[PDB]
Amino acid sequence: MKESLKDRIRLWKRLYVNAFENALNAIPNVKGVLLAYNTNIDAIKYLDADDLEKRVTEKGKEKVFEIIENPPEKISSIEELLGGILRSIKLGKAMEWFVESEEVRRYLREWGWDELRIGGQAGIMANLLGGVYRIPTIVHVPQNPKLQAELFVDGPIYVPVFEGNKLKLVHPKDAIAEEEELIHYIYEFPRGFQVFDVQAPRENRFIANADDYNARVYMRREFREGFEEITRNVELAIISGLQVLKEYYPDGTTYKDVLDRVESHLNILNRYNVKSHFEFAYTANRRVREALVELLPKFTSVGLNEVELASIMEIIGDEELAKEVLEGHIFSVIDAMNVLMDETGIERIHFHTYGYYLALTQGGGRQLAFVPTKIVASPKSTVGIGDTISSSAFVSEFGGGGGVRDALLFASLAAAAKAMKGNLERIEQIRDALSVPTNERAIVLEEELEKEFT
Ligand SMILES: Nc1ncnc2c1ncn2[C@@H]1O[C@H](COP(=O)(O)OP(=O)(O)S)[C@@H](O)[C@H]1O
């Protein structure tokens, strides 16, 4: 190891410690955070070979096996449910099919689960920002039956409720309603899991989606009739869930009907000077993706990864640039970030990939910030890491957390902490992430930015 690299390692160790100190002092200064729109329930079942074989045999083995080779990508019956699970096994492929049959939803609910967990980008961040970081959080919960409400951790997590004509903020467990359970059934299996002659080449999971409301970005009445009152209680907002929108719906609805409401919420937010952050998850429909780019000028910040940025370059960049962004080639990434800012004029773009983060901010000149991250060799959990990175950096920076790069450093600690411990309970635990070595390949990469850029 050359001394030029040993010194950089020493420097980044100090920056990480100071970035964590700064974040601990600024996070308490955030008046409140608004989180919308997607919250649901995640039901995890660890598949048992015998149980699954009994259920396949009971419903018709040939029917289920017919489906494996002729998948319908839409669960209309119990045999299509089992056939889809077995196909995810055979291929070791991550799959998710929508459940359009009430009868099998009863079968799913009856079949049960091993672990029950909050879902939706807005939901998981309510437990993080509110439960761990202790920031007053207002979260949008489309449907809040008892099963949904109990999944929020203790802390300053609130939902709006109407007391006749007044709006009140209460913990989700105190605002239970006779509403639908929005459950995503997640069936996990390891490598080697065998059912009849079907053996998994790798670990993976099959998801039976039984949630009609988040699929349409349903908004509950309190958020449509009391948004202004809600906005007065928050300083920041993080928006998500819009990646699902279809161009047309059976009842005649379009994506534009939902984005009209979203645009009205942004107008209210900007009127109160609330800083907003959009989570630009991969949006299959190209036209909806185009409308979301057109809506970014009303956002303060946007967060995305190599897949999501490459997907956006497919419609405002060139195919070659997208293919390089997808692989994390930093220079192509920087270009794509400037192309996105040129197209939208947004104030802040936060890019995260394996090894390093980037933040392009503008105001008095475009300024680029770069940090090498902390990679865990064997994560205990990998779900919600991306939301944790975007939310942590956004709340830390705009909380007065020490600047853009310091906010990225904190997000890198929060990501590493969640990975090595699985689930975070209090912010003090993130301190343990300081011991995770900083990615040296990314540290050396910064030398290339210092040559090209001056
Ligand atoms: N081992 C490990 N340790 C710490 N952090 C990690 C690790 N592996 C990946 N990452 C980060 O998580 C992101 C993957 O989540 P994505 O961007 O897909 O968002 P999601 O919400 O889907 S997890 C990816 O961009 C990385 O910056």
First to last CA, the chain: 26
Please enumerate, by residue number, every residue annotated as part of a binding site for D-glucose: 42, 96, 120-121, 184, 211, 387
Q: Which of 39, 47, 436, 37 is nearest to 261 (CA)?
A: 37
Cβ–Cβ < 8 Å for 269, 276:
yes
* Atom number, ligand 1, closest to the C-alpha of residue 375: 3
Please enumerate, by residue number, every residue annotated as part of a binding site for ADP: 305, 352-353, 376, 386
Catalytic residues, by residue number, are 387
Give the type of residue at 298: K
Please enumerate, by residue number, every residue annotated as part of a binding site: 42, 96, 120-121, 184, 211, 279, 305, 308, 352-353, 376, 386-387
Task: Concatenate the DSSP letters of all residues of 252-272 into one string.
Answer: S-BHHHHHHHHHHHHHHHHHT
Phi/psi-derived region of residue 229, left when phi > 0, alpha when psi is between -120 and 50, beta in every other case: alpha
Side-by-side strand order, sheet with 183-189? 74-75, 95-99, 204-210, 183-189, 40-46, 115-119
* Atom number, ligand 1, closest to the C-alpha of residue 378: 1
* Atom number, ligand 1, closest to the C-alpha of residue 388: 21
C-alpha span between 156 and 131 (Å, rounded): 7
C-alpha span between 184 and 99 (Å, rounded): 10
C-alpha span between 49 and 337 (Å, rounded): 47
Question: What spacing in Å lies between the alpha carbon of 409 and ligand 1's midpoint?
Answer: 15
Question: What spacing in Å lies between the alpha carbon of 354 and ligand 1's midpoint?
Answer: 7
Q: Could you give the C-alpha distances from 269 to 163, 275, 434, in angstroms and in order?
A: 23, 8, 36
E-only strand ranges, 22-76? 33-36, 40-46, 74-75
- DSSP-derived secondary structure letter, 249: -
Residue partners of 401: CB distance under 8 A and separation at least 6:
19, 22, 23, 25, 26, 27, 395, 407, 410
Angle between helices 440-452 and 330-344 (to 10 degrees): 60
Residue partners of 132: CB distance under 8 A and separation at least 6:
424, 425, 426, 427
Question: What spacing in Å lies between the alpha carbon of 382 and ligand 1's midpoint?
Answer: 7
Question: What spacing in Å lies between the alpha carbon of 416 and ligand 1's midpoint?
Answer: 9
Strands 275-279 and 301-305 come out as parallel
Q: Which of 180, 121, 132 is nearest to 157 (CA)?
A: 132
Residue partners of 417: CB distance under 8 A and separation at least 6:
424, 429, 430, 432, 433
Measured in residues, the chain has a length of 454
* Atom number, ligand 1, closest to the C-alpha of residue 418: 4
Give the residue whose CA is nearest to atom 24 of ligand 1. Answer: 353
Q: What are phi and psi of 201, to 5 degrees?
A: -75, -15
Question: What spacing in Å lies between the alpha carbon of 352 and ligand 1's midpoint?
Answer: 8
Angle between helices 255-271 and 286-295 (to 10 degrees): 10
Place of tokens 């190891």: 1
Place of tokens 């040939």: 62
Strands 74-75 and 95-99 come out as parallel
Residues lining ligand 1, Cβ inside 6 A: 305, 352-354, 375-376, 379, 382-387, 389, 415-416, 419
* Atom number, ligand 1, closest to the C-alpha of residue 308: 17
C-alpha span between 427 and 157 (Å, rounded): 16
Q: Which of 44, 14, 40, 36 is nearest to 266 (CA)?
A: 36
Question: What spacing in Å lies between the alpha carbon of 53 and ligand 1's midpoint?
Answer: 35
Give the type of residue at 18: N
C-alpha span between 3 and 281 (Å, rounded): 41
Angle between helices 49-59 and 78-91 (to 10 degrees): 140
Give the residue whose CA is nearest to atom 18 of ligand 1. Answer: 386
Q: Which of 253, 372, 273, 451 is nearest to 9 (CA)?
A: 372
Q: Is 324 helix (H, G, I), strand (E, B) or coil?
A: helix
C-alpha span between 89 and 85 (Å, rounded): 6
Place of tokens 């909806």: 288
Strands 194-195 and 198-199 come out as antiparallel
Angle between helices 286-295 and 306-316 (to 10 degrees): 90
Mutate which of 385, 423, 430 for ligand 1? The one with the most ligand atoms within 8 Å of its CB, which is 385
- Per the DSSP assignment, residues forming a β-bridge with 275 are 236
C-alpha span between 295 and 33 (Å, rounded): 21
How many CB atoms lie under 10 A from the CB of residue 114?
11
Q: Which of 193, 181, 161 is nearest to 88 (CA)?
A: 193
Cβ–Cβ < 8 Å for 41, 151:
yes
C-alpha span between 293 and 330 (Å, rounded): 22
Q: Could you give the C-alpha distances from 115 to 105, 140, 391, 418, in angstroms and in order?
A: 18, 23, 25, 18
Cβ–Cβ < 8 Å for 167, 161:
yes
What own/partner pairs with CB < 8 Å and gap ≥ 24 does 334-338 have? 334/358, 334/360, 334/368, 336/309, 336/310, 336/312, 337/309, 338/366
Strands 204-210 and 95-99 come out as parallel
Which two structure tokens, joined as six digits, stand for 317?
């960049």
Which two structure tokens, joined as six digits, stand for 53?
């074989």
What own/partner pairs with CB < 8 Å and gap ≥ 24 does 283-291 have? 283/242, 283/243, 283/245, 283/311, 284/243, 285/245, 285/246, 285/247, 285/255, 286/314, 286/315, 287/247, 287/255, 288/242, 288/245, 288/246, 288/247, 288/255, 289/315, 290/315, 291/255, 291/256, 291/259
C-alpha span between 155 and 127 (Å, rounded): 8
Residue partners of 133: CB distance under 8 A and separation at least 6:
27, 395, 427
